Scaffold this motif. Structure first.
Motif, short mmCIF file in Angstrom:
data_model
loop_
_atom_site.label_atom_id
_atom_site.label_comp_id
_atom_site.label_asym_id
_atom_site.label_seq_id
_atom_site.Cartn_x
_atom_site.Cartn_y
_atom_site.Cartn_z
N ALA A 144 75.21 41.30 -58.69
CA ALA A 144 75.83 40.39 -58.45
C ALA A 144 77.21 40.89 -57.20
CB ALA A 144 76.57 39.40 -58.75
N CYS A 145 77.86 41.86 -57.40
CA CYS A 145 78.98 42.64 -56.77
C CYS A 145 77.92 43.06 -55.29
CB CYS A 145 79.55 43.82 -57.59
SG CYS A 145 80.10 44.88 -56.99
N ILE A 146 76.89 43.78 -56.01
CA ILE A 146 76.51 45.13 -55.10
C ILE A 146 76.06 43.93 -53.70
CG2 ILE A 146 74.82 46.33 -54.33
CD1 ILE A 146 74.96 47.76 -57.05
N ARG B 139 76.86 44.15 -61.93
CA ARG B 139 76.46 45.19 -60.69
C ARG B 139 75.85 44.42 -59.85
NH1 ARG B 139 74.43 51.00 -62.31
NH2 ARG B 139 74.54 51.99 -59.78
#
Ligand SMILES: Nc1ncnc2c1ncn2[C@@H]1O[C@H](COP(=O)(O)OP(=O)(O)NP(=O)(O)O)[C@@H](O)[C@H]1O
Ligand SMILES: Nc1ncnc2c1ncn2[C@@H]1O[C@H](COP(=O)(O)OP(=O)(O)O)[C@@H](O)[C@H]1O
Ligand SMILES: [Mg+2]
Ligand SMILES: [Mg+2]
Ligand SMILES: [Mg+2]
Lengths: 747, 372, 139, 7
Positions: free
Chosen positions: A725-727, A723
């Motif tokens: 890393a995605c954001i 999460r």
């Protein structure tokens, strides 16, 4: 802690046993949880429990309930509910056990192409199916000559018969064939007629354990079958509680009475006879007992009981019914007599071919012989009734054993049996609003089978821990032997009951008092109910069950006077009646002691063998196809010991991962500094960073073993890293695209 | 598995068997004979003493001794022969393997229990044993927890009131009249008719006459008036040599001495008055429930008409408004054994046994505190 | 920030002013911050905006002077690479997988934004050189 | 016995 914002928990609910909730504000140590529901709730956190945490969705739906990281009642119930409702899969492993849910619907999965697909495959390879148990038993039998058992348990209607049927269809197809499976399926109508009864909860409850041995030759061709029976509920023949019936055959017989053949029996309607009358409920809704009679006789014919013997059987059963009407007048406190020219006894003697004057004498007197000298002496009206009912029970149990031996003559085959696989259909743990000597025996048999299960599973864990070279000490045995010693040791509940039967002026009031003196504060598993002096509580493996004393002494008494048997052995009217007896201490044994002995024969038969377990559960009462009811199912998962099996596995190391698949799953946690080309040492390095306690996991040779929490904790930290890393990346992308739109705004 | 032996020593019959069978499989007289004549034939296998049914078969050549007289064991070496014969010859069981249950009359000396226990532990090496009161066992046998048991064997007669399983030890009456001294009275009245039975074998013949031909009169005076005035009452019995002897009023007149012990010359009152005087020693709340059960036991209560005579004169003594009921099962001769057979097979009883551990620790004195 | 920087930022801001009152909406503040070289998260933008409610986010308008403290607060490679290496080790990233995670995890973006940023960066296999894509999106 | 009666 594990309770963070956007966690999920199960909270208890009245109308479905658990419901999901999302934890709307993270918890800190105290009394509050802010919860959100698929709306808005606050829940008191109270002694102490936190609400059961919920598994990450990757685990939900997998083929083996022990793959779940949190193991607890709602996670089990959820995985079965999703697999059944959404997938329409009906079979699920729990550890060694196969759980099987009755669909009340036909399914394509039993085709012979699938039979072939399962053959030769080990349990890891394929999705669970009853063939995957049959095939395991078959190859275990091939590897090592040791016989194999398959053990099928659950409330009646859970599909135990259909499970056995498909299990033997597998053998017939893989071995090839000798028409056993047809004959075995043709026997079920008679065993259901003699052996099943309506019960308060259930029609067609089975009151005995049925063991079918399928025998194999040296080729592992099917030779033929052999049938044993155990644990018959003799006491039902003479007594029923309200809304219960006697064994079906008596009502099939009574309803037939108008037919030409049965006219000579002088049968009445089913509430005329004392043994059928008591239960209150002669007619089952939606069954025609008169029609069922035809299926019974048809199956007798197919198994080759001659119509001579069939009329013999119906004679003996009409005998038992007429016998129950014989009524004694007490002429003294210690003497009784049968009123003159008594119509029930006149018909019973006519039916059975005995001299009226000898039955009329021997029913009311008993005979004692010193080695030189014999005394005839009277007996009270109570002893006369108890002895008539012990005769009726002894006739019925011998007729049952005879019909089983004539089935065995049809199923046997002459080739010498090299080895066998045997299939045991047995009732599960039982609890009703009222519990009585029948329920006490059934729950004690289930304590024995559950011990033999727990000890087999413990053996298999010790083998798997050697195979991975992990010290055994980490696994502890969970032993219900103290509850068995409560029931069956000397000075146990059954022992004091058999004492109070011979004790003078024994009664259900004084028996309870002997229990309270002996056990009440000496054993943790025995408790007295707060408000009553007539009941007692035993803490069984599944649950606490409260038993009423009020029946047990009448139900426990058997004693059969030899003279009353010798009258019947003397009969020459027809040949079956002397044949039944042909066969002295056993005549003195109580029903509880005959039960404990039949159970030791069963445990010897099983301990010789290597078991495989199937548990059947019945998801709804109304037989709606593919509907599931959480409050129904939680009862049967409790009664089948699935939930205690899971509790016993939840302590220990339930979750097991191959190093390859672990590394594949969690490369994301590893920093490129610490990825070696040896995976196993990378994993050993990393998990000790990610999890602080070496106790929480063990490094096996090929597999990592985790305690319950840890795999979900790793799933949490994985998801939270991914999460973040995605954001971070997507804010970079959005920032570039707005910077491009600003470049357009200059351009 | 292991089943207690149950043994009732009596006087006259030994009767013994295994717990939880329904009748004793050894029954034989507790009698020891020694030969008294000069043996003539060389090489006969002649034997020092005979026990039980052997000594009945040969009794022509033997002095017969009873080792028990009035429930007291007077001669110990002969009693060991009788037990040795019981276990090895009659039951064919090795005593080390079985608890033994032994029966005794109330109010007899303590040395008798101390010796019975010292012998069963030291010579037989019985693993566990117990000594039980004869009368208590007749209630187990008759299915009751209440009643005044009247028991008469050979030797001792006793009453024991019991109420809901509590004995009432101040009310126990014991009387030495029963059974053997009826035979020594019958031998004395038969001489009046010109028959002479002196030797210990002839006493066994008179015991058989008594068991066949004696009965109790409902009214003793009416029947002596009748038997003086008629031949109608008169029966004849055939001695072992084929002589025939004829017995008149003697046959009812012999067992009347149970109800009038002054005939033999005792002070004390008959069995009906010791039964009533035993109920009068119990507290008034329970007497109604003792009059409603009187349990007869032991062979001396087998005479025809003894129940109806007991009920007639106890109904004379008792207050008018009550049921008097005499219970006399046809099997009553074995009641003390059948009751001990029930008792030794209970599960609650398996803590009651004296075990050899305790005898080794406490010595034979233990029997008094552990047993009744 | 010097006068010239404030002037350039205000001019850009006024170009984004779609009403002529010299103001933007709160919902444009993040866009302007990103347009000025910042890469704040939506959470950071809402924080400097004061976590506005839907109504003021959609209709309340702010001039450059009120925006400026927020821009200041927002203003004040190897990690970026490892973050991309999470989804890798042959130097590629599936286009489908990057699309899925950006449109399905975290503060989900639209498929059109992802198509726009991904256009020309995936190869014939459907693999993205993430070091090149990262340098490109950081430029 | 030991005193009163003979046994
Ligand atoms: N796996 C299954 N597939 C299809 N139908 C099933 C299955 N299991 C159970 N049933 C149905 O469930 C009903 C009863 O099953 P059955 O095995 O006959 O139980 P039973 O007759 O009640 N024996 P018992 O459980 O001891 O009372 C029948 O309608 C079956 O078709
Ligand atoms: N049928 C009978 N009628 C009268 N007296 C009997 C009868 N049978 C036995 N007896 C007498 O009773 C005595 C035996 O009684 P029993 O109960 O065997 O003695 P114990 O209790 O000492 O063993 C003997 O005196 C015998 O003569
Ligand atoms: Mg069925
Ligand atoms: Mg069934
Ligand atoms: Mg006696």
């Amino acid at each position: 802690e594990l309770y963070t914002k956007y966690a999920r928990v199960w909270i208890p609910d009245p109308e479905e046993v658990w419901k999901s909730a999302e934890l709307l504000k993270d918890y800190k140590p105290d009394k509050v949880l802010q919860l959100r529901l698929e709306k808005d709730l606050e829940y008191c956190l109270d002694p102490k429990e936190l609400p059961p945490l919920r598994n990450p969705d990757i685990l939900v739906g997998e083929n083996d309930l022990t793959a779940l990281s949190y193991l607890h009642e709602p996670a089990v119930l959820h995985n079965l509910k999703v697999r059944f409702i959404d997938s329409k899969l009906i079979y699920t492993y729990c550890g060694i056990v196969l759980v099987a849910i009755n669909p009340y619907e036909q399914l394509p999965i039993y085709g012979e192409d699938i039979i072939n697909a399962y053959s030769g495959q080990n349990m890891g390879d394929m999705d669970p199916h009853i063939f995957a148990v049959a095939e395991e038993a078959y190859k275990q039998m091939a590897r090592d000559e040791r016989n194999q058992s398959i053990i099928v348990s659950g409330e009646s209607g859970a599909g135990k018969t259909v499970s056995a049927k498909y299990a033997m269809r597998y053998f017939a197809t893989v071995s090839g064939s000798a028409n056993v499976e047809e004959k075995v399926l043709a026997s079920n109508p008679i065993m259901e007629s003699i052996g099943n009864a309506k019960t308060t909860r259930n029609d067609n409850s089975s009151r005995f354990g049925k063991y079918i041995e399928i025998g194999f030759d040296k080729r592992y061709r099917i030779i033929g079958a052999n049938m044993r029976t155990y644990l018959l509920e003799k006491s039902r023949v003479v007594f029923q509680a309200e809304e219960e019936r006697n064994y079906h055959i008596f009502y099939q017989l009574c309803a037939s009475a108008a037919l030409p053949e049965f006219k000579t029996l002088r049968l009445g309607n089913a509430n005329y006879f004392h043994y059928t009358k008591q239960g209150g409920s002669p007619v089952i809704d939606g069954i025609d007992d008169a029609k069922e009679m035809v299926n019974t006789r048809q199956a007798c014919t197919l198994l080759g009981i001659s119509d001579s013997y069939q009329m013999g059987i119906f004679r003996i059963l009409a005998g038992i019914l007429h016998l129950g009407n014989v009524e004694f007048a007490s002429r003294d406190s210690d003497s009784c007599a049968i009123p003159p020219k008594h119509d029930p006894l006149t018909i019973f003697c006519d039916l059975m071919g005995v001299d009226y004057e000898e039955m009329a004498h021997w029913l009311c007197h008993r005979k004692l012989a010193t080695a030189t000298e014999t005394y005839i002496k009277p007996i009270s009206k109570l002893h006369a009734i108890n002895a008539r009912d012990a005769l009726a029970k002894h006739i019925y149990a011998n007729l049952f054993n005879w019909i089983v031996d004539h089935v065995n003559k049809a199923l046997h085959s002459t080739v010498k049996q090299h080895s066998f696989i045997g299939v045991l259909d047995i009732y599960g743990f039982e609890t009703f609003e009222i519990n009585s000597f029948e329920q006490f025996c059934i729950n004690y048999a289930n304590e024995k089978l559950q011990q033999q299960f727990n000890m087999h599973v413990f053996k298999l864990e010790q083998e798997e821990y050697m195979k991975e070279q992990i010290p055994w000490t980490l696994i502890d045995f969970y032993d219900n032997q103290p509850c068995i010693n409560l029931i069956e040791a000397k000075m146990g509940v059954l022992d004091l009951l058999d004492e109070e039967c011979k004790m003078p002026k024994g009664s259900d009031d004084t028996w309870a008092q002997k229990l309270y003196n002996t056990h009440l504060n000496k054993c943790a598993l025995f408790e007295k109910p707060r408000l009553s002096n007539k009941a007692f509580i035993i803490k069984h493996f599944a649950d606490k069950v409260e038993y009423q004393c009020e029946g047990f002494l009448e139900k426990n008494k058997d004693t059969v006077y030899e003279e009353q048997i010798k009258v019947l052995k003397s009969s020459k009217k027809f040949k079956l009646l002397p044949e039944l007896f042909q066969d002295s201490k056993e005549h003195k044994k109580t029903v509880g002691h005959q039960f404990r002995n039949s159970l030791h024969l069963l445990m010897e038969t099983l301990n010789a063998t290597t078991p495989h377990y199937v548990r059947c559960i019945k998801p709804n009462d109304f037989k709606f196809p593919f509907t599931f009811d959480e409050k129904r199912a939680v009862q049967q998962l409790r009664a089948c010991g699935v939930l205690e099996t899971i509790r016993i596995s939840a302590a220990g190391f339930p979750s097991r991962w191959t190093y390859q698949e672990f590394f594949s799953r969690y490369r994301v946690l590893m920093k490129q500094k610490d990825v070696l080309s040896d995976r196993k040492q990378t994993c050993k390095n990393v998990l000790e960073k990610l999890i602080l306690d070496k106790d929480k996991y063990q490094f096996g040779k090929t597999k990592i073993f985790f305690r319950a929490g840890q795999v979900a904790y790793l799933e949490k930290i994985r998801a939270d890293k991914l999460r973040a890393a995605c954001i971070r990346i997507q804010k970079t992308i959005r920032g570039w695209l707005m910077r491009k739109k600003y470049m357009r705004m200059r351009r | 598995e292991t089943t207690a032996l149950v043994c009732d020593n009596g006087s006259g019959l030994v009767k013994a068997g295994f717990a939880g069978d329904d009748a004793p499989r050894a029954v034989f007289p507790s009698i020891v004979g020694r030969p008294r004549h000069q043996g003539v034939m060389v090489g006969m296998g002649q034997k020092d003493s005979y026990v039980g049914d052997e000594a009945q078969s040969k009794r022509g050549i033997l002095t017969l001794k009873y080792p028990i007289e009035h429930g007291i064991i007077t001669n110990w070496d002969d009693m060991e022969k009788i037990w040795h014969h019981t276990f090895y010859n009659e039951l064919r069981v090795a005593p080390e393997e079985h608890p033994t249950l032994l029966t005794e009359a109330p109010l007899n000396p303590k040395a008798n229990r101390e010796k019975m226990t010292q012998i069963m532990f030291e010579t037989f090496n019985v693993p566990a044993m117990y000594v039980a009161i004869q009368a208590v066992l007749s209630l187990y046998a008759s299915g009751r927890t209440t009643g005044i048991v009247l028991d008469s064997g050979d030797g001792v007669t006793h009453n024991v009131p019991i109420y809901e399983g509590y004995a009432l030890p101040h009310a126990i009456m014991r009387l030495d009249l029963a059974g053997r001294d009826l035979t020594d009275y019958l031998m004395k009245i038969l001489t009046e008719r010109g028959y002479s039975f002196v030797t210990t074998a002839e006493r066994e013949i008179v015991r058989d006459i008594k068991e066949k031909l004696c009965y109790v009169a409902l009214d003793f005076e009416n029947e002596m008036a009748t038997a003086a005035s008629s031949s109608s009452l008169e029966k004849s019995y055939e001695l072992p040599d084929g002589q025939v002897i004829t017995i008149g009023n003697e046959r009812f007149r012999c067992p009347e001495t149970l109800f009038q012990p002054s005939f033999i010359g005792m002070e004390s009152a008959g069995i009906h008055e010791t039964t009533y005087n035993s109920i009068m020693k119990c507290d008034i709340d329970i007497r109604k429930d003792l009059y409603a059960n009187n349990v007869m036991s032991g062979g001396t209560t087998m005479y025809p008409g003894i129940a109806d005579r007991m009920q007639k004169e106890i109904t004379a003594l008792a207050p008018s408004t009550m049921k008097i009921k005499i219970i006399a099962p046809p099997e009553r001769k074995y009641s003390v054994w059948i009751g001990g057979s029930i008792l030794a097979s209970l599960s609650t009883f398996q803590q009651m046994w004296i075990t050899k551990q305790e005898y080794d620790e406490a010595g034979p004195s233990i029997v008094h505190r552990k047993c009744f | 920030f010097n006068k010239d920087q404030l002037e350039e930022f205000k001019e850009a801001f006024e170009l984004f002013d779609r009403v002529g009152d010299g103001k933007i909406l709160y919902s444009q503040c993040g866009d302007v911050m990103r347009a000025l070289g910042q890469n704040p998260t939506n959470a950071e933008v809402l924080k400097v905006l004061g976590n506005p409610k839907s109504d003021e986010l959609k209709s309340r308008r702010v001039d450059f002077e009120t925006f400026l403290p927020m821009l200041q607060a927002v203003a004040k490679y190897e990690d970026y690479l490892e973050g991309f290496r999470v989804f890798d080790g042959n130097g590629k990233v599936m286009g489908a997988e990057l699309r899925h995670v950006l449109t399905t995890l975290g503060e989900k973006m639209t498929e059109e934004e992802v198509e726009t940023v991904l256009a020309g960066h995936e190869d014939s296999n459907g693999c993205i050189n993430y070091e090149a894509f990262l340098k490109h999106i950081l430029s | 016995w030991x005193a009163x009666c003979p046994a």
